[PDB]
C-alpha cells in the first residue's frame, strides 16, 4: 500500500514543472529498521528457544 500511495503522490507532485516525463515503475527495496545500532531484535527472536 505504501508502494501504491507514493506513486500517485509523486506523479501529482511533478505536474506543474511540465517536464514531460513518464514513470514506468516505483520499486521499493528492503526496509531494515534496526538503524545498524539497535541490532538487539536478535534476543527477541532468541526468547523462544531458551524458554523451551
Amino acid at each position: 500500500v505504501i508502494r501504491s500511495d507514493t506513486q500517485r503522490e509523486l506523479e501529482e507532485t511533478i505536474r506543474p514543472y511540465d517536464m514531460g516525463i513518464t514513470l514506468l515503475d516505483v520499486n521499493f527495496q528492503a526496509a531494515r529498521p534496526p538503524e545498524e545500532v539497535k541490532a538487539a531484535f536478535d534476543d527477541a527472536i532468541a526468547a523462544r528457544e531458551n524458554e523451551q
Binding site: 536478535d42 534476543d43 532468541a46
Partner: peptide
C-alpha cells in the same frame, strides 16, 4: 539463518 539464532538452536 543468522549467527545467534543458529547458536541457540
Amino acid at each position: 539463518l543468522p549467527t545467534e539464532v543458529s547458536e541457540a538452536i
